[PDB]
UniProtKB/Swiss-Prot annotation, chains F, G:
UniProt-annotated binding residues for ATP: 156-158, 177-180, 185-194, 206-212, 217-219
SUPFAM superfamilies: 6-hydroxymethyl-7,8-dihydropterin pyrophosphokinase, HPPK, Tetrahydrobiopterin biosynthesis enzymes-like
Keyword tags: ATP-binding, Folate biosynthesis, Kinase, Lyase, Magnesium, Metal-binding, Multifunctional enzyme, Nucleotide-binding, Transferase
Provenance organism: Streptococcus pneumoniae (strain ATCC BAA-255 / R6)
Similarity comment: family membership: In the N-terminal section; belongs to the DHNA family.
Name by which UniProt lists this protein: Bifunctional folate synthesis protein
Length: 240, 247, 247, 240, 248, 246, 246, 248
């Protein structure tokens, strides 16, 4: 994949914990690599991108440079749909450490990914809860690529989406949605190829090959997708 | 794998979108990494710097493009053409006088391509079937993609079927796009081209699924696949064509 | 995953093999990359530079070591101890006044460690079986490796058997070596420790095979494995413990 | 894995095609990353390594900087068995290009790898040819780790070895050995985990799971090794 | 003497001859050495006796972007002229203006213009014998002031010519001072009569200008009014006080 | 003359005008050129870096000054005090993190001082004239300026003194006037005149060198030929000895 | 005086002592400081970089010299010829790839020249004396040195000339002697003397400035007061005009 | 004047006071500016009139490693002294010796010592009246030569004292010249009598040395022999030729 980079754009701002830092401000250096296929253009603007970055960077005084570096990434993805993966290093060479060094930097790195989430409900307006969820999901900026039809004391459905949130972060934002509708049932099923085993998340979801109703609605929107572990197209798993 | 690199070669030219730019020109800096096994050259066959730099600096100045991407890609595209030894290339084109009006170091575009072996299936069932296939494999050649090995074309209103093994540096999505472009420019059934495998790779995108999802189910595709590549391993089923064919 | 880095922090100290070095000391330069997900800190939890640098510069000067490796490793080892947030660390220690007598830039040693989840099996059939196991899991804790989850110990002259799930940054070969060192220092049957899995990893070296080659065949190991990690996937058999257990 | 690096050691020598270059000599800059586990030392010498490199580099005038960069790598592995993987960049900033640039470099990169090779013979002193082969192999600097016993109108055997030669280069050196004994039959079976499909080499060797005599002698020295494709221990493949 | 310096201030602007340059603009870099005696500021903690960078940099950067000049010399000269006007502490300048994106089409590090000026004490003889002799004189010292050269001390007038000599402070080098003298003469009907006498210590012998003016020690009415305002000033060639020269 | 130089020594401290700067501190870079004749050290005596850099760094961090000048001056002043070998010094203090909010390499202040030999005439005709004179040479010595040579003392009491100072002329002068003040200033008490400061020759509003009347005041030539009969008047291009025979 | 400077312009060429160097060529870096008064350009006249750099680079590559000096000198010489605005020039030629086999940043040669005003006395008392004189001023003009002012011509025939040259004194002299040669050198033909070159004042084995006898040769003061009666003798500290009334 | 310069030659050696430094050695960097008139070499393609770098660098680097000195000044002074001996083209030096691994234990860029010397014309008066007056004189000019100072011109001797003045070339600054004068006096039983008269143009007034020597214009036998070897040399203070001063 091709990349566009901006190396070491200088920025003055007022970020830092100390209220003296917020008062004097200091120099910050930004560097980013944006990845996407250039083959079509060969066969984004710099001035603009730098201008926006430089606007976004000074709208406020954050306490943490992490928080600013992340805002830039998030807003870059919102404004340049072309971009697939971004890596932004934010450097703070005047940090008040009192030692000699070249610099301290925080670098945040995010990649658009395709995922499938299962929704279920069985109390209240069973289907109202399903729609509210795809909505809350859309509101968080995650894109809804493709949704299945919904199946009839429970209602189910699955959704294909696109997000730059790492798996664990997606999961957290899924649980936050469960909360803010009073605890529905959202499950991350796959996020691409990926396969994890952490305390809070197993990918792919450990029961997919044994839940007919999940394979059902999964096979409707993604009959050819391969299960990264069983090495089989959904279409086929559904056949047993 | 081993690498030759040219770091920060300086070049003046006149690319840019603004007409003021095409008028004054500006400094550009080029860097590249070319990869290929040097074991043979080192032990007895290799690229020359003076020439490589000299050529790049010619191709770079031939014209003014609007976008530096387009110039970076051209240099990559032709380097591959002129130095078949090279397997993988990564070329960064830096534009440090870009008219941003802020302090930075530089703003660059870097294009990265690698040769890959791929298998594409051809089918025709109207007209001079067998010539439609030939003209497709020609368009392929003409777009710089290399025909490594080609099966024989069998009759399967019958289909002429064949599969071709090729070497190309176009990324998967791009190979596909050029495949469709070729279907178009021979009347869109006239020919069918399918991307079956590009090496080991496995993609699931809106436009391309690799490997192609019906390979293990299409005797006529395993037919021709098995003739030229019986030991190639299906990256999903984790079996040799040869074996998949025996059902 | 996101990263904090400290680039080129300068430090004077007295490490070196030569006694002339311990006497004059020299300049050293430290650089590191610490990795961990910053999404939570950025959105509501994070490391501080001033402190991190200040600590490193204390631990660096506590003593004179012979070898810079040993100082680099100490900084890594303690950074993990003091900042559990950190998942992966890569620390470069540059020694640009090294007494080589040739012109260069610098000569550095860089040590790189990542936390990993691993499963280790314990067995005992002599003495206070159940205490031998406890003391092993203690030695483990005492060497800084973390006990994440531990199965129950079952009787299988019977064996006490158990398996433990742990988090450690020691590379596979090193985990093993410390496993054997623990067998030694409790009388070498007193206890058996086996490395079963370290994540996804699969090695075949003279001293260690991962995953351990008999896991799918030892009901008593799947027993305890299935109790704490039934969904973990065997990286070879490409199945969940749970399933391997059902035979 | 940990690394030791030397950045930009300067060297004057007489390498180049032009006989003017051989005459005046010029400056060369060397940089290397040597990888091996440091955990044992923490719980190689620089002065020496630089001195040797700098000796080896000036013993001769090669035409190609590639050839010198490779000599250094090869000799480094011979002299420091500890080293597992090496990456040496040789830079030629005075190259006679007549343009402005920072430098042109060649960088050669090699890693020790475990491989298994099958030997067969069936004409002449069947077993004499087998022994001559393991010898020729040892003479090329490849290490013999472990050899099986030899099986009885053919004689077979398999060998486990260690080499930093990339797969294709191993293969070439195998065919060179076949030649210099008058055309035996050496086959690369595995080189570690690796799996290739090139015109001259398929790894693993496409017939292993179907050759009882190969599995035989393979199961003797490596019953637990996993077939990177069939995902099975040799021991088990041999059982059918 | 002490020096305050600003190294490599970055500034984007639109200066140059080509109209494509005035359209895209380009990066310029500034570096200056301001000189003056910092001993009072260091010692009395005297904020008024030092220059504030932040503001220096901020002004320079404003004056720098007010307009698009054709030549960078013109812009560099402007900052020098303005600094002297706004920061009377400063005694001597040297300001370098770098143009690294200059459309040369070769590799280099940079091109740069660097203008260097120093405040100087000078003496100027004024005569008139035509129209309102009297008036001409005043209007000349005024024209002088108008140009920003400073009048330090003026002698009484000797009233068939009328005569005066003035002591002034200027940063313009001697040749330019002379030119702006002649400029005034002209913008006055060619009446007045201006002569550079000394500019400090200096002694030149060029086509347009001889310093000290070669007739001083023989012109009684010049000593007359020179001894009035600088009796102790020493003739750089004859090596004596005006005072004594006048006594002959 | 030879030079010893320390290039870009880094130092953290808390100097600055902004209270946020005292609070946070920033990086400062120091570079100095000390001049002195090294021929003597090189041939058998010299400065250490270990020490010079250690002290500078101590001195630089003892306090927090509002102006970096006052600090850069502190180091020049102190250095001359503790290293009498040094004859001329140039010390540049750089403030790369100055809160200007523009891109630049840096801002710096560089203070440059040189030891010089001067002659000061003292006069008194009021109170205890003799005392007056003595207290002036003392005040002077107190300010750190060195007394090299003093003439005998010559109604009015006169004297002239040979001294060594690194203060530039104008500043030497100011300090002369300040002494006159702190001693109370028709009849006077004291009169300090700068007579010469080396070779130099001025013409400014506040001071003229050499002082315009020397060649014409016998009392001055008197006590001045006594301690420096061979010194050459930078303008009349003659020895004092000689100007005195007239 | 203001300065225009071109910093580290890169140029490839084939200069050098080693035949392997002519054959292969190497990189050269050039930096120049041209001085001239910019006040006039800045206020309404100046040099281009486009051009200055293009020409320098042409000139630098026309030939292959054994010494980099001869090349660095070529650029100074030519520049003064094509840009009469320039008054002083300093041009440094760096040879980073010089075949020294040691680590260093670079070796360089930097040639520095300044326009100066001089006075040359001409005499002839043999052959066609008048002609002799005229051919000398011509030879001179040929060498590029400019004739600013010539006195009228005064057995022996005498003359004195005001000229402008960038040659340092000693080299001006050498060229004077060379002319004397190429015109044939009791009775002579020509006599060139360096009388003054500005303000300057020498004392070397080959040349003394000002020439030690001026104040004592009427014929010289004669033709010299005629074209420069106000010029000041750098030593006697008087106008020629005046020295002539004696 | 033109200049040849060698920038940042790297050299490893074993110089310093600590014995751990003499044991490990460390990196030193050298940079010099050699000055002389390159006009002959540029013009006549005159190889003998330029300095060869390769060799310069090679020698310096040999002399640099011959020994371990305690102080870097000593080593820097050595290269200066030796260069002048081996490359008579060179008129003026400045050689900087950098010690970046100096065991200071703070961040800096470097420490450095930089020694700067210039060939000069000087005049020295010799007198004796004791033992073999005659002999003393010769042995002194010889001692002079021995130190490497060069005898350019010596006057005839004026034979109750015997007297001579010599013209020489030295790079030692005036104070050091005086010291080595006194050194000779001593290594001769304190007989001889050496006086620095002028060293060029220069005029000093320090504790140990007044230049020009303050009695020249009144000492007939000094003018006597000075007018013999440099009649046109000009007294930097009285501004007249020795020749004329002697005529009184």
């Amino acid at each position: 994949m091709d990349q566009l980079q901006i190396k070491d754009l200088e920025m003055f701002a007022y970020h830092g914990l100390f209220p003296s830092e917020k008062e004097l401000g200091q120099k910050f250096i930004v560097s980013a690599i944006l990845s996407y296929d250039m083959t079509k253009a060969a066969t984004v603007h710099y001035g603009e991108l730098c201008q926006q970055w430089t606007t976004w960077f000074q709208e406020t005084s954050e306490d943490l440079i992490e928080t600013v570096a992340y805002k830039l990434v998030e807003r870059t993805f919102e404004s340049y749909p072309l971009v697939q993966e971004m890596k932004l290093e934010l450097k703070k060479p005047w940090a008040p450490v009192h030692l000699s060094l070249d610099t301290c930097s925080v670098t945040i790195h995010r990649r658009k990914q395709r995922a499938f989430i299962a929704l279920g409900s069985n109390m209240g307006d069973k289907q109202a809860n399903l729609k509210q969820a795809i909505d809350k999901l859309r509101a968080r900026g995650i894109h809804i690529l493709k949704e299945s039809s919904v199946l009839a004391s429970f209602a189910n459905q699955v959704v294909e989406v696109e997000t730059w949130l790492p798996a664990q972060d997606l999961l957290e934002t899924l649980l936050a949605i469960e909360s803010e509708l009073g605890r529905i049932d959202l499950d991350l099923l796959f996020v691409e190829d990926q396969i994890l085993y952490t305390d809070d998340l197993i990918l792919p979801h450990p029961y997919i090959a044994e839940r007919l109703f999940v394979l059902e609605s999964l096979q409707e929107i993604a009959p050819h997708f391969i299960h990264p572990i069983l090495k089989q197209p959904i279409r086929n798993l559904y056949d047993a």
